[PDB]
Design a protein around this ligand. Structure first.
Ligand SMILES: CC(C)(COP(=O)([O-])OP(=O)(O)OC[C@H]1O[C@@H](n2cnc3c(N)ncnc32)[C@H](O)[C@@H]1OP(=O)(O)O)[C@@H](O)C(=O)NCCC(=O)NCCSC(=O)C[C@@H](O)C[N+](C)(C)C
Ligand SMILES: CC(C)(COP(=O)([O-])OP(=O)(O)OC[C@H]1O[C@@H](n2cnc3c(N)ncnc32)[C@H](O)[C@@H]1OP(=O)(O)O)[C@@H](O)C(=O)NCCC(=O)NCCSC(=O)C[C@@H](O)C[N+](C)(C)C
Lengths: 402, 402
């Protein structure tokens, strides 16, 4: 299929079946980095993402579009021929839906013994009858993993946003596939990978949860963007708006205490000389620390705080709003935000490829394709006759091609 | 170095320098999957994570511990010998700190032309003088990327939690390194990777931000855990506690409207027959929808809602608290939470390896090592004499070994 040769993944053949964020995100990351990536959509329906007015232009770029009923007679027979040339297949469904419908890993490996198979689901490929076959979205994975309960204010739990768990899960699928791809080069044998969204999110929520699993208490939720345990960490207000900061390190603490008027606290039994973090709940002086930090910050502008925090090696930043991003000199300097052309010739704006590969940078070579745009070009590459693909179209096995 | 042969990454040699979450997380994921992973700590100081009472037992497991002043005379000379046997090196610092201190990518490639180098920083390896060399933590990356402003309640922005951006950045580093590792096998030439935390997070926040970049408005923040745009999506309350749900799909909407008493809305100009999502702000009936959903949900228990939502293929889940995770039958069935022994022989509880590799599952083979635990065993493997390592210890170039 005609495509520029670029990125660390040039000439890798990746195929994905899935809607919305998680599976498509996993597959599309391959295409950001120069892989040949085929997006499978249903025949009668199309990927739900297409309902979004702008995002899909970013989230489906560099992709080739396919419409095949991958479960029916000849539609199934081509999917399996396709799999013989594919290095990596990502599928996102309700549990072992592929296996239930006949496309086992064993069936897939009969067509390609080397194939890497990444299964993405809410609850896993196996488990109990109650959960294994349930549908899931980001929010369901946040709820079930204990991530949701950790987010929000003291009195109001809420999801991390936008759709955080869908990005973690898709990114994990990309990572695990690439690791499995490595193993295939070493041994010539394929792999199957069972990525459960709740299990991904369980991991991402362990920083304090590990306290609960090993004798401790669980942490509370943040109060108004402030770290639940650590003073001087999180959302603060200066004289002229919100900043973030992290009071971390021996020197940072010594010098910051001196500024806010707490010099005399340094060297006491509960704050000995090598102290690199202050726990707000364990420390009787924790609230005092907050009171003085808050009071000292409200006196200074964001610019004055930044200048002094730079002198002390204290990490901080202005809380930026979306309209402030484009003109930020760091963004401009690094071309963090760029433009490209859509398939119909409009100009599209949004993030550049990330991260930056030095020797083999990714690039944007195609806009989002339309439903089944390349279904006819792929089936013909897979050896199917000109008439043969006309017969797939008619029987409703292959679709759109508009 | 003595270690079991397992996982898709068996026999891969990975080295990382970094503290807290982001860099160490990137490097440790390799070890979850059977790579030989060397953790570098400073000589006089030790990784800040060690201050946490339990988490490091999970986040530093399967690792080999090294203490070398990687910038001083002979300490530097060994780091570079080590690099000659290393496949992947992950470093997390303030911008191009390694280059500034003399360890360029060019210097590194003179020792190993194949080496994959992953640079993790807040603001990138290059940019403007104002930002490029600034320190960063999760919160700084959330602030600078527009992610922070998207999280929280209508009136109160707050970070996604716990330390969300540190996990995305580290996971991206793992992914990018594995992709670059692939390219080395294809061409025999190494790679350098520039992972800026704000650029990672910019990507993860694009779902609605793409509206702003292309003519639209930016979305508001959630109100009490409810999707800012889409009715029937997010945090809801049943008669006996919090659930999440996603009203998505043609059938799901038709049948749910019928239940909540909104049957008559189906088929109107603004809700035509194929409607798969309802936008709450664009739709005059959006608030009505919420009012009826809320009212119908408050009548039913979580169990009754789940049973009916299963009948209709509507994704949902109980919002679980941490103490509910261990005994969940899906968790138990999949061994999502497991136990292992620490280096000093205590029993440790926490998440199992994720995801599940079928043919080559990861495993937990070692607890977190102590500071410099393996520094003497690594230097001797790298060819340094028994006396030679005694001279490194004394001059303060190599440390702990306790
Ligand atoms: C799709 C899904 C989310 C549940 O929806 P569904 O039951 O309507 O399934 P479907 O894919 O739409 O298609 C229904 C049937 O259609 C079949 N099908 C799908 N593609 C096909 C093809 N090419 N050929 C033949 N059959 C095909 C499927 O196998 C399936 O058959 P089954 O009933 O036997 O399972 C399910 O795939 C699933 O749970 N996947 C795992 C987790 C996952 O990736 N979910 C998405 C997370 S991303 C996310 O959270 C974003 C979201 O929150 C944002 N928003 C608020 C806007 C919605
Ligand atoms: C460490 C860092 C976070 C800023 O701290 P620092 O300035 O104190 O740097 P350091 O690593 O502690 O060491 C200071 C010096 O010590 C040197 N050094 C470090 N290791 C060495 C070695 N082995 N040999 C010789 N020198 C060594 C460093 O090069 C460095 O020299 P420089 O001043 O020339 O830059 C910086 O590495 C950085 O910004 N990294 C990139 C982003 C990153 O990974 N940050 C962590 C995100 S994870 C996260 O967000 C978790 C956190 O939010 C949770 N909590 C609330 C509890 C804190």
């Amino acid at each position: 299929l005609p495509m520029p040769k670029f990125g660390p993944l040039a000439g890798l053949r990746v195929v994905f079946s899935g809607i919305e964020i998680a599976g498509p995100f996993a597959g599309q990351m391959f295409a950001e980095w120069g892989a040949e990536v085929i997006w499978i959509e249903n025949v009668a329906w199309a990927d739900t993402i297409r309902v979004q007015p702008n995002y899909p232009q970013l989230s489906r770029r560099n992709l080739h579009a396919l419409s095949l009923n991958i479960f029916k007679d000849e539609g199934r027979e081509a999917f399996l021929k396709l799999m013989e040339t594919t290095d990596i297949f990502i599928e996102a469904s309700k549990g072992p839906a592929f296996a239930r419908r006949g496309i086992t890993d064993e069936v897939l490996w009969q067509h390609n013994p080397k194939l890497v198979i990444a299964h993405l689901s809410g609850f896993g490929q196996y488990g109990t009858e109650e959960y294994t076959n349930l549908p899931a979205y980001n929010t369901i994975a946040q709820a079930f993993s204990g991530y949701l309960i950790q987010n929000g204010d003291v009195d109001q739990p809420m999801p991390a946003f936008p759709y955080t768990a869908a990005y973690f899960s898709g990114l994990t699928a990309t990572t695990a596939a690439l690791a499995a791809l490595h193993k295939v080069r070493e041994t010539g044998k394929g792999e199957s990978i069972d990525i459960a969204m709740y299990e991904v999110m369980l991991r991402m929520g362990q920083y304090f949860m590990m306290d609960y699993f090993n004798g401790g208490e669980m942490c509370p939720r943040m109060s108004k963007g402030k770290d639940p345990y650590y003073a001087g960490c999180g959302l603060y207000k200066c004289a002229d708006g919100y900043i973030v900061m992290e009071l971390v390190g021996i020197t940072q603490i010594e010098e910051c205490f001196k500024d806010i008027g707490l010099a005399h606290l340094l060297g006491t039994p509960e704050i000995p000389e090598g102290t690199q973090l202050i726990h707000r709940i364990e420390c009787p002086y924790g609230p005092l620390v907050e009171e003085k930090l808050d009071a000292w910050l409200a006196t200074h502008t964001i610019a004055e705080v930044k200048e002094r925090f730079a002198e002390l090696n204290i990490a901080c930043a202005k809380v930026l709003t979306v309209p402030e991003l484009e003109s930020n000199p760091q963004y401009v300097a690094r071309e963090s935000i760029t433009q490209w052309q859509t398939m119909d010739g409009r100009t599209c704006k949004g993030p550049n490829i990330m991260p930056k590969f030095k020797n083999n940078p990714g690039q944007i070579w195609r806009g989002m394709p339309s439903h089944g745009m390349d279904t006819a070009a792929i089936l013909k590459n897979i050896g199917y006759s000109e008439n043969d693909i006309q017969e797939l179209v008619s029987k409703g096995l292959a679709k759109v091609e508009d």
